[PDB]
Amino acid sequence: NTVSSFQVDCFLWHVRKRFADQELGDAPFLDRLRADQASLRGRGNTLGLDIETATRAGKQIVERILEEESDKALKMPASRYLTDMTLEEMSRDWFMLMPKQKVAGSLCIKMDQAIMDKTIILKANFSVIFDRLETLILLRAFTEEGAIVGEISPLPSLPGHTGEDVKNAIGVLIGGLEWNDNTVRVTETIQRFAWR
Amino acid sequence: NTVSSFQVDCFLWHVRKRFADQELGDAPFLDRLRADQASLRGRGNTLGLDIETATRAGKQIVERILEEESDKALKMPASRYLTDMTLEEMSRDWFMLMPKQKVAGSLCIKMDQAIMDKTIILKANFSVIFDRLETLILLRAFTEEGAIVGEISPLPSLPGHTGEDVKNAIGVLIGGLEWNDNTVRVTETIQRFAWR
Numbered sequence: 001n002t003v004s005s006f007q008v009d010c011f012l013w014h015v016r017k018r019f020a021d022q023e024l025g026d027a028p029f030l031d032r033l034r035a036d037q038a039s040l041r042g043r044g045n046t047l048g049l050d051i052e053t054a055t056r057a058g059k060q061i062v063e064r065i066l067e068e069e070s071d072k073a074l075k076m077p078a079s080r081y082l083t084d085m086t087l088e089e090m091s092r093d094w095f096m097l098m099p100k101q102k103v104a105g106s107l108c109i110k111m112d113q114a115i116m117d118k119t120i121i122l123k124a125n126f127s128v129i130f131d132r133l134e135t136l137i138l139l140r141a142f143t144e145e146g147a148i149v150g151e152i153s154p155l156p157s158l159p160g161h162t163g164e165d166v167k168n169a170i171g172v173l174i175g176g177l178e179w180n181d182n183t184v185r186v187t188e189t190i191q192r193f194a195w196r
Numbered sequence: 197n198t199v200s201s202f203q204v205d206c207f208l209w210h211v212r213k214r215f216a217d218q219e220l221g222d223a224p225f226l227d228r229l230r231a232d233q234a235s236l237r238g239r240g241n242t243l244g245l246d247i248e249t250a251t252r253a254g255k256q257i258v259e260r261i262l263e264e265e266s267d268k269a270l271k272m273p274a275s276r277y278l279t280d281m282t283l284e285e286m287s288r289d290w291f292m293l294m295p296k297q298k299v300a301g302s303l304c305i306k307m308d309q310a311i312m313d314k315t316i317i318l319k320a321n322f323s324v325i326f327d328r329l330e331t332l333i334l335l336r337a338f339t340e341e342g343a344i345v346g347e348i349s350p351l352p353s354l355p356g357h358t359g360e361d362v363k364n365a366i367g368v369l370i371g372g373l374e375w376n377d378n379t380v381r382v383t384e385t386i387q388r389f390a391w392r
Contacts, residue, residue, distance in 0.1 A: 001222070005215065005221050018261045065214045065218065
């Protein structure tokens with residue numbers, strides 16, 4: 001019922017205690033240890049379970065969380081994060097006068113149809129595995145005048161996208177922008193790890 | 197400085213999160229997880245360290261606490277706890293009219309010199325290893341009338357006592373009580389695992 005967590009808390013307290021027992025602790029850490037020691041005393045007396053017994057049970061529970069595969073996440077060959085945009089560029093507000101958008105590939109593609117005869121460069125932040133795109137964080141279209149006129153973003157509620165879905169989204173965005181006689185290019189990052 | 201603990205907290209949060217992720221959690225556990233998730237977000241932004249990076253560093257720190265000998269406490273062959281007294285008997289108030297006491301063997305020996313011509317039984321709670329006494333919790337002398345007239349207790353500030361120190365303390369207590377024509381015996385627990 002409630003003993004599973006109590007036991008986990010008692011073991012994790014022990015672990016934090018051992019951390020303190022080996023120095024390096026800041027004052028708020030020791031303060032939390034004191035508050036938790038008092039709270040665990042209370043919870044123990046209410047439950048009737050000795051702190052060391054609970055600690056050992058917690059140890060076995062924590063091991064159970066960490067048993068079997070544990071955290072041996074050796075199936076993600078060090079993805080490298082590549083960026084063309086700063087956090088401000090990704091979070092910057094923008095608007096479309098004649099908005100146009102669609103969903104495909106678990107990606108949302110947006111572009112302003114009011115943009116005409118402009119020169120546009122695409123910038124993106126994304127993860128790369130084996131010299132190819134693996135996850136898209138964000139792509140935005142900027143005019144030479146600095147306006148944001150299009151965007152490709154992942155949809156968090158759908159099964160994740162692939163590199164080919166992003167390549168298709170980029171091609172679709174470029175096509176739609178080119179319709180209005182815009183000149184569209186991509187950064188070297190996109191040109192090297194993705195495709196126009 | 198303060199990153200060592202923060203990192204430990206982030207990993208331990210992850211562990212508690214995985215516990216939640218595998219059910220069995222009570223409402224206060226999840227509530228603490230929410231408060232801690234918000235607090236860790238704050239602490240992260242203040243420190244500038246990503247929660248996953250801190251989590252991995254915390255994992256390595258926790259492993260460091262648990263590395264080498266870890267908790268392989270295989271040098272304490274299952275001590276068995278034997279009791280003659282309830283918690284109330286050990287915590288019961290008592291007094292000596294003519295107090296007498298000494299320190300020896302990292303034990304405090306007390307007896308009331310005013311007790312005469314009584315029949316006394318000694319009761320004790322202690323740990324046993326290999327069919328012999330290893331740690332004394334408490335020993336008290338009771339008259340047949342129920343009065344507490346003597347006590348042998350460990351002193352927490354001194355190097356721990358041995359079984360032979362307790363045997364000597366019991367012999368000394370019995371001797372002092374016998375001086376005043378008291379008849380003193382011990383429980384079967386003491387007679388089997390210690391000596392008069």
